[PDB]
Design a protein around this ligand. Sequence first.
Ligand SMILES: c1ccc2oc(CNCCCCCCCNc3c4c(nc5ccccc35)CCCC4)cc2c1
Ligand SMILES: *[C@@H]1O[C@H](CO)[C@@H](O[C@@H]2O[C@H](CO)[C@@H](O)[C@H](O)[C@H]2NC(C)=O)[C@H](O)[C@H]1NC(C)=O
Ligand SMILES: *[C@@H]1O[C@H](CO)[C@@H](O)[C@H](O)[C@H]1NC(C)=O
Ligand SMILES: *[C@H]1O[C@H](CO)[C@@H](O)[C@H](O)[C@H]1NC(C)=O
Length: 534
Amino acid sequence: DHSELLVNTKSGKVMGTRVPVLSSHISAFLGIPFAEPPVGNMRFRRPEPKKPWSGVWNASTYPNNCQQYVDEQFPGFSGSEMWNPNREMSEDCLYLNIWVPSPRPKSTTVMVWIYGGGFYSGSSTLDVYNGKYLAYTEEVVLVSLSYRVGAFGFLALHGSQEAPGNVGLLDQRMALQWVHDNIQFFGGDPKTVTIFGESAGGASVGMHILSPGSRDLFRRAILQSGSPNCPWASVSVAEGRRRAVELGRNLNCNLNSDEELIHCLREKKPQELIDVEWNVLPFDSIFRFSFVPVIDGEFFPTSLESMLNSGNFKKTQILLGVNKDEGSFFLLYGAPGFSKDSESKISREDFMSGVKLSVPHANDLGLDAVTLQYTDWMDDNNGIKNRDGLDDIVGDHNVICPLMHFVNKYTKFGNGTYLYFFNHRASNLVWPEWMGVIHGYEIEFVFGLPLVKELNYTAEEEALSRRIMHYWATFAKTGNPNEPHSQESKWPLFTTKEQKFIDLNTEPMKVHQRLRVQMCVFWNQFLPKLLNAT
Ligand SMILES: c1ccc2oc(CNCCCCCCCNc3c4c(nc5ccccc35)CCCC4)cc2c1
Ligand SMILES: *[C@@H]1O[C@H](CO)[C@@H](O[C@@H]2O[C@H](CO)[C@@H](O)[C@H](O)[C@H]2NC(C)=O)[C@H](O)[C@H]1NC(C)=O
Ligand SMILES: *[C@@H]1O[C@H](CO)[C@@H](O)[C@H](O)[C@H]1NC(C)=O
Ligand SMILES: *[C@H]1O[C@H](CO)[C@@H](O)[C@H](O)[C@H]1NC(C)=O
């Protein structure tokens, strides 16, 4: 080798870069391709594996982020801008990143990060997805993948093979193929790969657990605030088709045959599709899960629920959880009365509307049912209560109760579940109090940022991040987040009978049972039953 930053891989030779890590240093390989650029006539198709290359691929800088809608609701605002692309956007975007410990290890554990963003945005290159503190602190090879989002990734004319749909999931699978085939040269154990991810990354993980074509490519799985059965995470092939033809209609396109339609859509510039993306949604939910995975009979042989009942999925160990206020950012962005700079107390009227916004698929009875469920009628004009109740509505319906359904289903067949509730609101949070513990805001703990002194996290936050990185890495290494026979308090296994989970915050650990049963019984059993009858 005569070098640490040089690696020969079944695709090509790769030149690394040396990086500082809290006064130490590590190796890092940025922007390694794993597939052919999906440009021109390749748009909306299955990816192809990268054609192997003569020479030294300069893997010393982050790659172009994929093409997505950017978030300008708060220009200049870091809380919101941290999530936007920070490298140039381009259809040429299927690369990946490895952080290897230094000195290069023998065959140690690999974690692969799959970003979220609702399947319409996201980027592998964000400050908070910086793999170096975790790769360093826990001695793991940390990969981060990238995948087409939006129409580029999920336009779906089932029957067609030109835009079959799901292709963004296939992007991830191929990144995962590549880890299977090449991570050995980098010091990592291809028999010890944990895929982890948040939001749509969390659901993508769960979809790889489910899909036959992906199960064999990894060992263990972490799902953070996302689950494949989330209502924003998939659509029927009928509704993908319907939505895809509506992108044509919106862009003046021939609609007689798929060939016609795809051809038209392939001619248009990127920002053009992005600009009419919103306008495919029936009406509506706020924000733009236009193009998402399809239940296609291929990647997904049958319906998720049926897969999940029959046990048709990978049986291994999972670690997963939710944040206390998943819903808060949705309300801020899409619902009246809710604004970044006020306490956002909610009139009783703005509650009726907010309910309607959050449960689009429901009839008047559904809305009454949800309203009854979440309303204190001894004090129905409390604007804090109404504001918080709406938050819980949105959080439970879209993240917690689908996640709890998945957990109870998986655990009947799987080989060990661990379940967390992250309810710490960070000291240095730039968002207003009423949002609480926000969708996405445990990521920074997982990826080590509170160990950087520059960023003003408290010491008790430094200890939390260290504890969490350990749980995560110990779990990836062993299928269990606890240390062999250590003094520290044990995070119990989640079981069907007893359903224990822990909080994840600065106070000493507490174990609980049945995370949000009452509401989840409502969302998972009662409400669907009531809508199917009426
Ligand atoms: C209620 C209803 C639907 C929901 O779907 C999801 C899962 N993914 C949604 C992410 C797509 C919206 C992201 C646009 C802004 N990017 C952010 C993202 C996240 N958190 C944010 C918090 C505050 C402001 C912006 C955030 C975390 C996920 C990455 C994108 C969560 C969720 C909650
Ligand atoms: C995970 O699976 C392992 C192995 O597939 C299970 O361990 C076996 O348990 C049976 C009965 O408990 C024993 O007869 C064997 O000695 C164990 N085998 C091994 C290889 O350890 C284990 O119980 C499963 N874990 C969970 C939490 O479901
Ligand atoms: C790798 O690429 C970047 C792009 O500007 C450059 O800064 C860096 O010095 C290059 N290294 C080599 C080996 O050329
Ligand atoms: C704490 O650090 C931040 C960096 O995000 C810095 O901008 C800020 O000025 C510091 N706080 C105070 C009170 O000076």
